[PDB]
């Protein structure tokens, strides 16, 4: 069989965080939208980004699967995405056998 890969990405918009007393450019507070019900609703969520014009993070998780052909892997990854509440624009690169699904790219 062949190894296929999936990158599931969500986009986050960052601004200055608030740490103890006040704002900081050191640390970034980053909000994004997580699907709470497939096809119906999402809700706001956040994360912190610390690194020792807009500011955007893309949080990606990747996984692989063995399959005979791209069509089989597409079915598998589609179902995996739905099950895990991942929805967005899909692409496929045949050269690298890699699918991507990205959520909220309109931000970038």
């Amino acid at each position, epitope marked *: 069989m062949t190894t296929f890969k999936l990158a599931a990405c969500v986009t986050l918009r960052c601004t200055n965080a608030t740490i103890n007393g006040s704002l900081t450019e050191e640390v970034k507070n980053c909000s994004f*939208n997580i699907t*709470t019900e497939l096809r*119906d*609703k*999402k*809700q*706001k*969520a*956040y994360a912190l980004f610390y690194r020792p014009s807009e500011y955007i993070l893309i949080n990606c998780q990747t996984t692989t699967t063995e399959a005979v052909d791209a069509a089989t892997a597409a079915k598998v990854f589609k179902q995996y995405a739905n099950d895990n509440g991942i929805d967005g624009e899909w692409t496929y690169d045949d050269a690298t056998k890699t699918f991507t699904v990205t959520e909220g790219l309109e931000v970038l």
Partner: antibody
Amino acid sequence: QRLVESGGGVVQPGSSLRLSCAASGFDFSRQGMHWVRQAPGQGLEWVAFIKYDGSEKYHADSVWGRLSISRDNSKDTLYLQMNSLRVEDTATYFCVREAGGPDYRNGYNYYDFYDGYYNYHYMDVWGKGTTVTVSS
Amino acid sequence: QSALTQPASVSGSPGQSITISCQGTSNDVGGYESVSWYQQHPGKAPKVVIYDVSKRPSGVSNRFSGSKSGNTASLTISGLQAEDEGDYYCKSLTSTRRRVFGTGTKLTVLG
């Protein structure tokens, strides 16, 4: 949707008072709330707004430091704490609901943190109000 | 934020079309599509007749309409009827997330 204010009366200038509003008939924990006041024979004056989860508050400059808004979502109750009252704080005080809901994009309804409503920027429910008279 | 400016009084005969203005600054009225209007009758709470500058909540007849040009918003009532008599207040979101009311207008249907 119904809002019932209470806690009003006559109070000494410089003393404190806590107004209450009991909400019913709607999901209190998802909606923002305001206090608005009206002095007899005068116009409406916005007092304060508080987000559905209580995580943010805004107050008019004329009341800042004296009047402060809070809420208890487990009681479905909105509060206005009034400190160091002035004769000029005499008025009817209304508890008011901010109309809100999801934001629609790309086939999805988007909600704020914890599934709270985004604000639609108008007031769709008022209580009858409670009267505060400040006099020594 | 200073209170939004409204005329103290407007009037018309039954059937007339009248307009009530509300003037803000670019940080409230001119900065957002969030202007709303409230009708208040004696001894009662106000009720919203228009929001998001042009929109009617359900139950409000199409005799009520609203529009915005620059820093001034306007409420228009056509086919004026006796029951329209009362006080009207505009309100606006501001840039600081506060809200602000106009100074109010008494509408008189001429009797």
